Symmetry: D2
Subunit: 122 residues, 4 copies
């Protein structure tokens, strides 16, 4: 019947962004959560997708989304500090593939995603 | 270097929510967009994921995310009205599978996603 | 330690192959099965992938695989007659997306897959 | 109109199978190929899926397939020696996630897949 907006990156720190390697941290807040008080499925995905986009930028490329996949491994909670790590695992002539993982402050794996993108150009 | 928060469902209309069938509409606004002025990949995913969650609720179930997939077909733009349609395509004893599609106001297909969930219970 | 080769399409009937629409039937035999006597995960995928390839051919296109996804819904068994139905759900300038479903002789849904392909040309 | 059966593991060597780690090699032969003389999409998937199944066995578990994904990176060719490497990247109470990669004899990455399985038991 009613639910609040889901928001992502109301806070973040770019730790690394260089040559296809990206690390970004963010703290889980109330707008990150679903009904059950866990990190929203869309929120966690958006975290990964954005970092994927940064990997692409870091390569001097312009990209457009094609297909994306995600596995949910462990719930995120309010006040968790999530470390988002992106890597380009395949750079093709016309496509790129990015792998992105999220771990919490205890080192536990939260989710893992893969992004298949089309290279719009340089 | 810098980017704004990505937000989803700052506005929405639930048109249908009954027995595994869900339709929700929303208007694309500035917080929905990426750098290039298109609907953000995470935004479109979050739209689908939330409606998937509603399909599950509409069945009287509690669900937890496992794996999710999305295909991006056509860009969303500022002021687009996006119609989000969810259906449970498989209700298993212990898992559910939801298909979710988004179409714009011109009837064009924007994206399509599939959600594989674990049934936490009734 | 030891396992037999997995084989697909040692028998098949093309029922329909026209303008992006494909239906193919096949009977599950011993070489289709895994250790537990169910239709092998790779076998069911191969069934879908091949029919996806036929959808592409039926459109007068040449395609190359990019990314593919599958959901397993119900086990296939020896002597099942599996109906494999393929459709192009999106024909883009440079990519295609195919949806493929398998149902058994009792009308039950066995698996469902999605193929994202690159158009090599006409 | 006509096409030959697609077959997988008509030859193979298990190099490693221990505690969630699996390496298997196989040589690409004529029955592995599609129309265009490349390794068939279903063939490469079947290679990965089978090794995923071995990872699960190596853990003393019984598994059933749920959802699987694959990215195709570079074509396989006749006489290629493909090295298939599987790992369990997440062992949950009720599910497992396997990552599987294939590289050819030149060290080039051919494809990469992810398997989400349900643990039937011990």
């Amino acid at each position: 019947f009613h639910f609040d907006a889901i928001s992502a990156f109301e806070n973040y720190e770019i730790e690394k962004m260089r040559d296809g390697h990206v690390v970004v941290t963010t703290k889980v807040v109330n707008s990150s959560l679903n009904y059950y008080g866990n990190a929203h499925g869309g929120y966690l995905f958006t975290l990964c997708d954005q970092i994927s986009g940064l990997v692409v930028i870091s390569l001097g490329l312009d990209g457009v989304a094609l297909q994306s996949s995600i596995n949910y491994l462990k719930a995120g909670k309010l006040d968790d500090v999530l470390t988002i790590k992106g890597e380009c695992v395949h750079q093709g002539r016309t496509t790129c593939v990015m792998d992105v993982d999220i771990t919490n402050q205890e080192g536990r794996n939260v989710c893992k995603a893969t992004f298949t993108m089309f290279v719009t150009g340089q």
